[PDB]
Amino acid sequence: SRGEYVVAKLDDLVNWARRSSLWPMTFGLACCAVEMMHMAAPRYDMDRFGVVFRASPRQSDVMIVAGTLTNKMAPALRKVYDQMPEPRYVVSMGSCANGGGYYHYSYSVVRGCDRIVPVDIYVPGCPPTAEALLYGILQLQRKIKREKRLRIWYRR
Amino acid sequence: PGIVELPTLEDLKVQEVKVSSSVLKAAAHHYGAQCDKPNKEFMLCRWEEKDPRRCLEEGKLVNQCALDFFRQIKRHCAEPFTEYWTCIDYSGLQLFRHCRKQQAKFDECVLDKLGWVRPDLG
Amino acid sequence: GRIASFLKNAWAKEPVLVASFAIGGLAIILPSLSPYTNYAIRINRATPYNYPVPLRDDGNMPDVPSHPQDPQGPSLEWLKNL
Amino acid sequence: MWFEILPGIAVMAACLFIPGMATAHIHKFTNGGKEKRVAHFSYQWNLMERDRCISGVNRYHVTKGLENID
Amino acid sequence: MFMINILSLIIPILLAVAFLTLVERKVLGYMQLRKGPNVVGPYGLLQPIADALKLFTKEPLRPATSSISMFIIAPILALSLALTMWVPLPMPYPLINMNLGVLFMLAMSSLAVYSILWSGWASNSKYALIGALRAVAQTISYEVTLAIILLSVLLMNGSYTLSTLITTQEHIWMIFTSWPLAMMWFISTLAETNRAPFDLTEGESELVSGFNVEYAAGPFAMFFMAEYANIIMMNAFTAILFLGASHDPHTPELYTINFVLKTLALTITFLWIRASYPRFRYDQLMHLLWKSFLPLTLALCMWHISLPIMTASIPPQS
Amino acid sequence: PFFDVQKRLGLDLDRWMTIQSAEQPHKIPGRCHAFEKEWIECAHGIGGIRAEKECKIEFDDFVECLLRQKTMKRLSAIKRQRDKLIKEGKYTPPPHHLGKEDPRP
Amino acid sequence: MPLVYMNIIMAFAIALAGLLMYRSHLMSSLLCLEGMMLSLFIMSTLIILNTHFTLANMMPIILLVFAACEAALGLSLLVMVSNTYGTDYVQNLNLLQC
Amino acid sequence: MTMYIAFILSTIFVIGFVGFSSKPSPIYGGLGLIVSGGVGCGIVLNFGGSFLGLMVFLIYLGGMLVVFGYTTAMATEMYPEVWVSNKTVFGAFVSGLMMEFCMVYYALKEEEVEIIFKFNGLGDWVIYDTGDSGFFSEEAMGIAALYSYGTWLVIVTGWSLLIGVVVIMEITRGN
Amino acid sequence: MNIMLTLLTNVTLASLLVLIAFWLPQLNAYSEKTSPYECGFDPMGSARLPFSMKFFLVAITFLLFDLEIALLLPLPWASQTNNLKTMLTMALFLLILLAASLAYEWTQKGLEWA
Amino acid sequence: SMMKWNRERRRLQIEDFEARIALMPLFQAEKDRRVLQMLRENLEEEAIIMKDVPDWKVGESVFHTTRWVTPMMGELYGLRTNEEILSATYGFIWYT
Ligand code: SF4
């Protein structure tokens, strides 16, 4: 159907815009943030891919939970995620963020950021290498490329 | 109070100098040099009398003299003047600076055929 | 002597104020002793903003010209040479 | 390398160039192949109105020369 | 056809702003041993378009504590004023030729400041309020010196008509006549556009995002477009005022090309400064302008008033 | 207590701007220079009490030039009459007033 | 008199009524003073331009200069009042009575 | 409709005055003052006063900036008031708008309205003069005579401004 | 009228952009998303409480100096007079009075803050 | 360099002003004739318009003085078309 073709092409345009311009928020909890900065560094510059760190949650599109999320910090993380406008995607970097890692059995650690906020891509490692984080970001971009919001709207 | 004594339409009818602003500006200096007398008489009438009605005849004389000036130009120096006023027309401010060469052509032709000399600065 | 010490301290510590005061003082002083200021006044006067109203001839005005391009009256040769 | 920056600068330069050229050529088209007349003082506007009257088509740019005389 | 001219001025300027974002990202990256955006489009050309689409397809959030009317009005004011200021500029022929175009631009720049203050106040957030107050302090610091420098330079022009600047600088650039005023003017333009080292209103490092901390999606895009357009417009004003260009009336394209190149160079200088220098403290910015720039500007204004008189160089009024 | 220090010392501190008929830059005339001059000349040295009635014609002309109240009233009456005639259908504006003739240069 | 004069004089009347009818804040009444000054500027400018009183086209600028002087005075007093009471509320100027 | 640009702008001016005079929070009153200043600039430019109007707009734009900062500092309130947040402010606003609308329609319809003076409904274009100023801007030449004719006004105003700086310093010393 | 048309066009473009930004996107507005931003934790007080201005004196002096900015703008046309001596004297008088005011405030610790 | 260029500019301005001076008398004559013609047309059409109205003298002056008073915009263009009125009143201001 011509309507299906138009919807598919418009969805392609929107997904391309969203994946090409991915603005992570300046959120780094722990050692994994340093590998994130190295990703921002010249060798693996993420600005080439359109990933620009923006501080304000309302002006950001992706939250990368780099570092251990303590029970004290979890409400702030949830608040920052909520204040972030949608579409919003969450990437969990490092074993500490993914499932608690080295401090899984600590009283003051949330055993994974999945408990607090929905996570789209999990980047393994402790710390994950900057190339690994870039791979995760590109995987998130492909995931956005696979999204079918307008097609589902037309079919619904 | 009293009725205003406006002049009749026929009396205020005169032959008109139907030339564009660029054409007048191109010939402005020679026009002032040649037609000074009647123009100065009309100006004195206007400033002393302070009535537009009182000086209508002098204005008619002014218009006639301007027409005669343009007629002599057409007879003797038409083409150089046409090029000159064409050049001035292009500039939005109608600057003299951009058209110095065509002005030189017009001045030389006018000096030869008609003997007019351009008034100097001031 | 002490004035020189003050000037050196000013240039070392507050150069901008020294330059500003020097420039302002020169602005005040130099125009008074400049020959060309009268030329500026004359140029401003010479500009023909308003029409040169003719004056009636009573026969006793030798200096006033009876027509432009006549030897009588003001001259602008000075500005042309300037 | 550094030359890779140049293409975006060229695109920006073309975008910036478009306005001035468009303004100049639009003025030329509207004003009969001549620059739009600048009226910064009342005298020039009076000249423009007189030209509008002289033209006969109510367009100031239309210029009547020696031919109209006599 | 005047509407066509208005669209011709507006639409290309916005595209220029979009590609200026790409140029800045690449120039800063290369000055930082990086490559600016290159993945999205050949040499990163399509990155701006992707950013605009992403922002305008992103949810706009109206803060619960915000005053909606001012919150919405502020971006509209910023963008409309940014586009308006381009109108009087002679490139070479201005869209609107005003006898007092320079004062018009000054007043319009003054008006644009309220967009930042209104946005920050309406946001009803502490960081936004701090950014608005910083913008107030910045205007207090820079407006007087900007006006005095512009007056001093325009004394040689003889008018506030922007078009006549071309005639005045026909034989030489005015930077040679007034290079100190040119330096202070460039810094003041940096201050007015809220660009580094005077990027205090946004101040990401110190204030999370400054006045726009509560703005997302389209309104933030409008604020960004206004910012970049103001950068380009102010640099173009500097090019017209000081770095004059040759204008052949029969061929305006030459003047347009020269002017565009000079403005591009000045904007690149803006990005260069943002990369090189650190940020000032707003107390330090106000002190710089009031204690250092203002006295020198007063002295130079006296000098420029006297110089035409003592040198018999008073410019023609017309 | 108007100590006329200006008149005593021959200083024109502010009298230059007191009237519209005084000297102005580049001899730019005021919109009512003639009426103001006539009124000032009429009421000179005769005192305010006398001038208020012996120069009332001059002052009324000056006020009419300044405000145009009577001229505006007459123009409004003429326009009202013209509109009423047009409504009645017994009047038709001339072609030159309607724009069918080129106005005199 | 044309209607624009009517509107501008009405604006002056409205500003005067606003200033004479305080509510709580002093800043608002200082803004009403500034509004009165703006209305006066507009009236003077219109009169001087319609009557071609060339040497009187500077009077509006002097009026504006002294209006800004007055505004500065008002704000400098408001700052002291706020410091001494914590608010700009007019009800705190109550120590002096009668 | 373009035959009466002046009237529309003056009505906008009066509405801005009814806005800042009903006394909302100083922020919205400053908004009203800014709008009224812009409209007054429009009116003065329509009458031929480009420099004066632009100067008013520029000066009030800067003045309202300091007012805005002062408000956020001294004239601040937890719930700032808009023209629809209190019955008094909205009463004042509505009364002002109604009073305008009343006089506006009265004068537009009636040939000659007379509130306190006599006003004629004929458009402002009538009063304009038919003369020519030549190669000059009469407003600019008059405003420039402050330095050639108004030496006394310059003296007085300069002294007033210096004494104003001194006065502000003394009034804000605060002992 | 050209200036009016240009202003209308620019304002209409901006308003259309705002409309497209507030209507094209999808929205899931909930209380926590529209709450004020305080770097993750909740604000203590309001953002409408008084915010002390440590540079009040400089602001009032800014008003007083913007007056002088207004007074000095006619200078370009003033240089066209025939009494250039008086014009120059008065212009330098005004600029020297502005300099004096700045110097007084500076020396009296008025340009400093707090 | 600026001194030289500005002096040349002043000389060219003098040249332009002299051209205006030369052309002004003809313009003054044209303007006076046009104003008188417009006033006469207004007077005649008014004589047609208000012949019926009682106690209305036609072309009666509102000034006691029997002296020429420059007509206001309303007098010349009062009964002309709206486009003419807009042009005369606001053309120079609006033109840009
Ligand atoms: S996962 Fe490893 S590198 Fe990352 S924050 Fe935890 S301990 Fe540090």
Side-chain angles (χ1 to χ4, degrees):
Chain A
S1 178
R2 275 178 46 260
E4 275 289 358
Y5 180 83
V6 174
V7 152
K9 308 315 288 184
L10 287 187
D11 215 24
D12 295 333
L13 188 53
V14 303
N15 299 331
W16 169 85
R18 289 172 180 173
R19 57 191 184 96
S20 302
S21 306
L22 277 178
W23 294 355
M25 83 170 312
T26 55
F27 192 74
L29 300 177
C31 336
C32 291
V34 189
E35 280 292 8
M36 191 176 57
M37 304 183 303
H38 278 259
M39 179 187 70
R43 179 170 293 184
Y44 310 99
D45 83 302
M46 46 154 211
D47 198 56
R48 269 194 310 105
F49 307 82
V51 176
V52 195
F53 270 119
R54 191 132 194 92
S56 178
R58 317 201 175 280
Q59 306 171 356
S60 62
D61 323 318
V62 181
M63 182 182 67
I64 305 177
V65 184
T68 317
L69 181 63
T70 66
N71 293 11
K72 202 167 189 178
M73 176 72 207
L77 181 148
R78 183 70 212 196
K79 265 269 292 184
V80 188
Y81 175 76
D82 289 320
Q83 294 181 164
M84 183 160 46
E86 314 192 33
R88 60 197 176 184
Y89 312 90
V90 171
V91 167
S92 185
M93 184 190 184
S95 296
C96 301
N98 296 347
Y102 208 176
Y103 314 89
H104 179 96
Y105 302 107
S106 183
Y107 48 90
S108 56
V109 174
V110 183
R111 298 155 194 96
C113 69
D114 171 62
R115 296 192 169 179
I116 311 303
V117 294
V119 179
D120 301 7
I121 299 294
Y122 300 69
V123 185
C126 171
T129 158
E131 241 168 315
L133 183 53
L134 203 49
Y135 180 87
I137 291 182
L138 304 186
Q139 181 173 352
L140 177 66
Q141 295 184 356
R142 294 193 299 276
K143 179 174 187 176
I144 301 176
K145 183 174 189 177
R146 288 152 30 195
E147 291 198 340
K148 314 182 192 307
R149 276 150 153 158
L150 293 183
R151 299 88 163 280
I152 299 304
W153 165 74
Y154 192 78
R155 306 176 190 278
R156 64 172 51 241
Chain B
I3 303 293
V4 184
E5 338 217 54
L6 295 172
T8 63
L9 285 178
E10 334 103 16
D11 71 70
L12 58 77
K13 295 179 179 174
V14 189
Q15 244 286 350
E16 277 292 347
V17 188
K18 286 284 189 175
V19 293
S20 177
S21 61
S22 58
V23 185
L24 284 170
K25 187 171 184 178
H29 284 70
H30 287 109
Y31 168 75
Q34 302 301 320
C35 304
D36 187 74
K37 180 53 183 178
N39 301 345
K40 296 294 182 173
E41 257 167 330
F42 172 71
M43 295 283 72
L44 184 68
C45 184
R46 287 297 282 101
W47 292 82
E48 288 189 352
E49 297 283 356
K50 285 136 187 173
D51 266 64
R53 307 118 78 179
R54 291 297 306 270
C55 303
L56 280 171
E57 246 66 70
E58 287 94 332
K60 292 183 181 65
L61 293 181
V62 172
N63 198 303
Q64 310 171 11
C65 198
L67 290 174
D68 302 350
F69 167 91
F70 279 119
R71 289 194 184 90
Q72 304 175 17
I73 290 188
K74 179 189 299 183
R75 291 187 319 186
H76 289 76
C77 271
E79 290 318 303
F81 181 71
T82 52
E83 297 154 23
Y84 187 21
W85 73 253
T86 53
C87 177
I88 281 186
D89 214 5
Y90 186 83
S91 48
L93 292 170
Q94 297 179 335
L95 302 170
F96 287 122
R97 341 149 37 191
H98 299 288
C99 301
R100 284 309 155 101
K101 172 186 293 182
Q102 298 80 5
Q103 167 198 158
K105 290 149 40 191
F106 174 64
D107 289 5
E108 165 262 357
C109 88
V110 123
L111 181 55
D112 306 330
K113 267 63 77 64
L114 293 163
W116 302 347
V117 185
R118 213 220 191 195
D120 287 16
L121 194 78
Chain C
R2 47 187 65 89
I3 311 87
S5 74
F6 178 86
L7 290 181
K8 166 162 280 188
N9 295 348
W11 215 19
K13 250 132 290 299
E14 46 191 30
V16 192
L17 292 179
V18 177
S20 61
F21 276 109
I23 306 180
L26 291 185
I28 303 183
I29 306 177
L30 293 189
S32 65
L33 54 87
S34 178
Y36 289 104
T37 58
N38 286 230
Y39 277 109
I41 303 179
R42 303 173 57 188
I43 298 179
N44 289 23
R45 310 193 89 104
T47 39
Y49 287 116
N50 48 3
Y51 185 83
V53 183
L55 42 75
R56 173 184 297 263
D57 195 4
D58 49 17
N60 41 273
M61 312 164 165
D63 300 334
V64 186
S66 63
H67 156 57
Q69 296 178 346
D70 289 1
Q72 312 81 12
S75 161
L76 259 299
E77 255 68 21
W78 56 274
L79 225 180
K80 281 188 293 292
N81 304 343
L82 253 183
Chain D
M1 296 175 60
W2 65 273
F3 22 89
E4 287 194 349
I5 309 177
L6 295 182
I9 300 180
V11 182
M12 179 181 181
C15 297
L16 287 180
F17 178 85
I18 296 181
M21 174 274 278
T23 304
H25 287 312
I26 295 179
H27 282 176
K28 296 265 291 304
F29 182 86
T30 53
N31 300 278
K34 306 177 297 297
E35 305 180 3
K36 157 181 288 297
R37 194 161 301 171
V38 176
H40 286 329
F41 308 94
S42 58
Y43 170 75
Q44 305 171 136
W45 176 253
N46 291 1
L47 297 188
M48 292 186 52
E49 295 276 279
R50 182 180 175 277
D51 290 2
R52 290 175 65 261
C53 294
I54 292 188
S55 64
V57 301
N58 216 7
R59 265 81 76 86
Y60 91 90
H61 46 261
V62 178
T63 301
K64 309 253 139 294
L66 296 165
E67 72 269 8
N68 269 45
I69 315 174
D70 64 287
Chain E
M1 278 210 56
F2 179 64
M3 181 64 180
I4 287 75
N5 211 160
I6 308 178
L7 293 180
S8 306
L9 178 58
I10 296 180
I11 301 178
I13 257 53
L14 293 172
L15 304 177
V17 163
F19 288 109
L20 170 64
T21 305
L22 166 67
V23 171
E24 176 180 60
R25 300 236 303 242
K26 296 202 66 63
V27 171
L28 293 184
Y30 274 96
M31 292 192 296
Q32 296 162 343
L33 251 227
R34 306 182 303 103
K35 298 189 183 63
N38 66 3
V39 176
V40 185
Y43 309 103
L45 282 178
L46 276 65
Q47 180 62 34
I49 299 84
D51 290 311
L53 287 171
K54 173 209 82 66
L55 279 176
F56 275 96
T57 60
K58 190 100 173 299
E59 159 174 10
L61 80 313
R62 174 257 216 90
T65 62
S66 71
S67 174
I68 177 184
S69 62
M70 307 302 303
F71 189 86
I72 292 185
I73 287 304
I76 302 174
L77 183 73
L79 190 57
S80 62
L81 291 183
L83 295 181
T84 293
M85 296 189 66
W86 275 93
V87 176
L89 289 179
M91 309 170 308
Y93 312 111
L95 184 64
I96 297 303
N97 199 10
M98 329 175 188
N99 267 321
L100 285 152
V102 163
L103 300 190
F104 174 87
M105 287 189 295
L106 254 60
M108 252 45 191
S109 75
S110 291
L111 217 200
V113 180
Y114 287 93
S115 71
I116 299 181
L117 299 358
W118 290 345
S119 65
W121 183 87
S123 164
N124 201 324
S125 180
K126 298 164 183 286
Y127 284 101
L129 184 69
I130 302 184
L133 273 296
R134 289 190 145 179
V136 181
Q138 196 155 359
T139 49
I140 293 185
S141 67
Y142 84 82
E143 195 65 53
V144 164
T145 67
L146 189 96
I148 291 187
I149 301 171
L150 171 129
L151 201 180
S152 302
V153 292
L154 293 177
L155 276 168
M156 287 171 175
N157 179 29
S159 67
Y160 293 97
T161 305
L162 285 160
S163 303
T164 61
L165 272 62
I166 314 307
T167 70
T168 65
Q169 311 169 45
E170 243 229 341
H171 290 251
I172 200 177
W173 293 348
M174 264 179 57
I175 191 180
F176 298 112
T177 39
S178 60
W179 64 261
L181 291 171
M183 292 180 172
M184 291 185 295
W185 170 264
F186 190 71
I187 290 302
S188 296
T189 61
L190 279 172
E192 171 183 322
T193 52
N194 307 296
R195 289 288 294 180
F198 315 115
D199 197 312
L200 315 178
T201 63
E202 210 251 338
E204 156 137 338
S205 67
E206 186 171 348
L207 312 172
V208 184
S209 187
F211 62 102
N212 41 310
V213 67
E214 229 75 19
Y215 279 88
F220 167 76
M222 277 165 251
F223 276 130
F224 232 46
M225 288 182 293
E227 225 287 51
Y228 285 121
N230 288 314
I231 300 173
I232 308 182
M233 176 271 305
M234 293 303 299
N235 287 145
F237 192 9
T238 75
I240 297 175
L241 237 180
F242 302 98
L243 312 180
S246 172
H247 175 45
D248 178 57
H250 301 279
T251 50
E253 355 280 345
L254 302 176
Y255 173 92
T256 311
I257 306 174
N258 210 7
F259 157 84
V260 172
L261 293 179
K262 303 182 188 298
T263 64
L264 291 176
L266 289 148
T267 63
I268 304 308
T269 310
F270 259 50
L271 321 173
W272 194 5
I273 295 182
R274 171 178 180 176
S276 58
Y277 306 135
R279 180 190 307 113
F280 260 119
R281 202 174 56 192
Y282 73 136
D283 190 8
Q284 301 175 359
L285 157 86
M286 173 168 298
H287 284 345
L288 175 72
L289 278 165
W290 276 76
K291 313 272 217 62
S292 165
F293 279 14
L294 191 41
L296 202 55
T297 59
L298 298 177
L300 290 166
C301 185
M302 307 184 189
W303 176 258
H304 279 267
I305 303 182
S306 54
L307 189 73
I309 303 184
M310 47 178 172
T311 67
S313 60
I314 309 253
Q317 182 175 1
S318 57
Chain F
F2 178 19
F3 308 111
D4 223 331
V5 66
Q6 304 184 30
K7 196 166 74 67
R8 180 60 185 272
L9 306 185
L11 294 178
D12 179 65
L13 296 181
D14 56 1
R15 324 193 74 90
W16 47 274
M17 188 196 299
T18 48
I19 59 179
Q20 173 187 185
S21 300
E23 176 186 8
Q24 296 188 353
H26 306 280
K27 275 60 183 301
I28 305 181
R31 187 168 186 263
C32 303
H33 171 81
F35 300 97
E36 186 184 13
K37 185 191 72 60
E38 288 299 345
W39 175 72
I40 297 177
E41 293 188 358
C42 180
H44 176 69
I46 76 177
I49 300 179
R50 287 185 59 193
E52 183 170 1
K53 37 186 171 298
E54 298 184 12
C55 301
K56 185 174 186 302
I57 302 175
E58 324 289 357
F59 185 79
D60 294 355
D61 296 333
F62 188 19
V63 180
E64 178 58 11
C65 177
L66 283 182
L67 293 182
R68 295 290 180 175
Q69 294 180 353
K70 295 189 299 299
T71 304
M72 288 192 301
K73 174 183 290 69
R74 148 155 290 188
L75 294 184
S76 60
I78 292 183
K79 293 211 307 178
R80 288 173 50 89
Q81 181 64 188
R82 180 276 309 273
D83 297 329
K84 198 281 289 300
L85 274 55
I86 294 300
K87 290 268 296 182
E88 306 295 1
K90 292 94 81 296
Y91 177 76
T92 302
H96 44 85
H97 276 279
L98 295 180
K100 274 50 273 180
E101 297 190 9
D102 60 331
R104 172 181 294 269
Chain G
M1 305 180 58
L3 271 33
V4 286
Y5 295 168
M6 175 196 66
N7 273 283
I8 302 182
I9 301 177
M10 166 82 54
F12 178 85
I14 298 179
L16 188 66
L19 175 59
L20 300 186
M21 308 191 70
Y22 303 79
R23 306 185 45 248
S24 52
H25 293 279
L26 229 180
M27 195 58 249
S28 310
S29 49
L30 308 181
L31 292 179
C32 301
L33 277 168
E34 302 173 0
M36 293 189 309
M37 270 295 186
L38 175 59
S39 63
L40 289 183
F41 183 106
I42 306 304
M43 259 274 66
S44 57
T45 302
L46 294 193
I47 303 179
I48 304 300
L49 298 174
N50 180 24
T51 58
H52 295 262
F53 200 156
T54 305
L55 238 39
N57 295 110
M58 64 184 69
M59 116 86 165
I61 313 180
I62 286 70
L63 178 158
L64 217 64
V65 169
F66 283 98
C69 289
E70 164 186 337
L73 217 182
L75 290 187
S76 180
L77 289 166
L78 185 157
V79 60
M80 296 298 87
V81 169
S82 175
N83 294 7
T84 62
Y85 301 111
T87 58
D88 70 342
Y89 290 1
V90 168
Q91 308 81 4
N92 301 328
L93 308 183
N94 197 6
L95 304 189
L96 310 181
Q97 296 165 335
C98 299
Chain H
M1 206 64 170
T2 62
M3 193 76 173
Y4 306 96
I5 305 295
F7 192 81
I8 312 169
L9 295 177
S10 59
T11 61
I12 305 181
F13 193 83
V14 179
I15 300 179
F17 273 52
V18 179
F20 78 74
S21 299
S22 55
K23 298 188 191 62
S25 72
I27 285 69
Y28 301 101
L31 321 179
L33 251 192
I34 302 178
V35 177
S36 57
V39 173
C41 176
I43 313 178
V44 178
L45 302 225
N46 296 353
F47 273 84
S50 62
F51 179 95
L52 289 178
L54 289 182
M55 208 65 283
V56 214
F57 202 31
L58 196 161
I59 286 186
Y60 271 67
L61 243 39
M64 246 46 60
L65 274 194
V66 320
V67 176
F68 174 70
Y70 255 52
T71 307
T72 60
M74 352 260 192
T76 335
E77 185 181 15
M78 180 184 298
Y79 298 112
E81 288 180 342
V82 201
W83 295 279
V84 305
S85 301
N86 181 16
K87 296 196 182 303
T88 65
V89 186
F90 185 75
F93 196 77
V94 175
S95 63
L97 296 183
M98 203 51 50
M99 182 54 58
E100 189 192 301
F101 303 156
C102 273
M103 279 42 280
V104 168
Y105 155 78
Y106 191 2
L108 296 176
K109 172 190 179 64
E110 189 184 57
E111 273 295 338
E112 179 68 16
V113 70
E114 169 201 28
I115 314 302
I116 311 291
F117 317 81
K118 307 199 59 50
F119 297 100
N120 189 337
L122 294 178
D124 314 327
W125 75 267
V126 178
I127 65 182
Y128 285 58
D129 192 17
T130 63
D132 160 77
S133 63
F135 267 141
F136 259 157
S137 177
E138 296 188 6
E139 56 168 331
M141 304 311 303
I143 297 175
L146 175 68
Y147 297 91
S148 59
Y149 291 79
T151 144
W152 188 231
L153 289 174
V154 170
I155 299 179
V156 179
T157 53
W159 185 253
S160 61
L161 292 175
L162 179 54
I163 304 299
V165 179
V166 176
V167 164
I168 272 55
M169 287 277 305
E170 292 302 347
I171 297 177
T172 54
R173 168 95 44 65
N175 287 8
Chain I
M1 69 308 178
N2 285 340
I3 186 58
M4 316 169 61
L5 202 169
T6 62
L7 301 186
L8 176 78
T9 55
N10 303 12
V11 182
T12 55
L13 178 152
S15 60
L16 161 149
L17 289 187
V18 177
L19 263 289
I20 300 176
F22 278 96
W23 289 99
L24 180 150
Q26 233 281 349
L27 305 88
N28 180 213
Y30 53 93
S31 58
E32 287 298 340
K33 179 149 63 178
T34 55
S35 55
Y37 168 81
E38 201 65 17
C39 293
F41 290 94
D42 52 1
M44 279 66 189
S46 78
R48 292 293 154 83
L49 264 36
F51 194 80
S52 67
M53 172 178 296
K54 303 305 179 64
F55 54 93
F56 64 113
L57 220 176
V58 188
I60 311 303
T61 60
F62 167 71
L63 293 186
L64 286 193
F65 285 50
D66 215 6
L67 283 190
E68 287 141 341
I69 293 296
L71 282 175
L72 292 168
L73 287 187
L75 280 175
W77 303 294
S79 308
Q80 305 295 347
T81 66
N82 313 36
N83 320 329
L84 284 194
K85 218 69 57 60
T86 92
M87 182 277 305
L88 188 50
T89 63
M90 292 309 146
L92 296 189
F93 169 87
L94 266 190
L95 282 180
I96 300 172
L97 285 197
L98 193 163
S101 63
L102 179 60
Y104 174 85
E105 188 184 0
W106 189 346
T107 59
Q108 303 295 349
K109 274 58 271 294
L111 292 181
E112 289 66 4
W113 287 17
Chain J
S1 67
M2 201 62 60
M3 169 186 64
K4 305 266 297 303
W5 183 221
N6 285 5
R7 296 179 178 172
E8 189 53 54
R9 265 141 60 83
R10 294 300 291 253
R11 291 184 285 260
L12 301 171
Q13 181 187 37
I14 296 187
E15 209 174 323
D16 226 306
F17 289 173
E18 285 181 315
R20 169 182 178 262
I21 288 177
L23 299 178
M24 277 189 57
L26 173 71
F27 293 157
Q28 181 60 225
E30 302 173 335
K31 175 186 183 62
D32 108 78
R33 290 197 297 263
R34 164 173 53 90
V35 165
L36 298 178
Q37 173 180 355
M38 289 190 292
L39 285 180
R40 168 134 292 274
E41 298 175 343
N42 297 331
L43 173 54
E44 311 235 36
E45 81 185 323
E46 171 213 28
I48 306 306
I49 294 184
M50 306 199 72
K51 59 183 293 77
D52 41 310
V53 165
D55 53 72
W56 178 274
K57 283 166 53 66
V58 277
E60 178 187 8
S61 176
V62 114
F63 297 82
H64 298 276
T65 336
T66 57
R67 178 219 322 162
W68 171 258
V69 186
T70 61
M72 77 186 317
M73 275 296 307
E75 305 178 32
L76 290 177
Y77 289 88
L79 302 178
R80 289 281 229 268
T81 178
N82 295 95
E83 243 298 290
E84 272 178 280
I85 304 180
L86 279 187
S87 180
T89 48
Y90 302 108
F92 175 63
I93 296 81
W94 288 357
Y95 185 68
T96 44

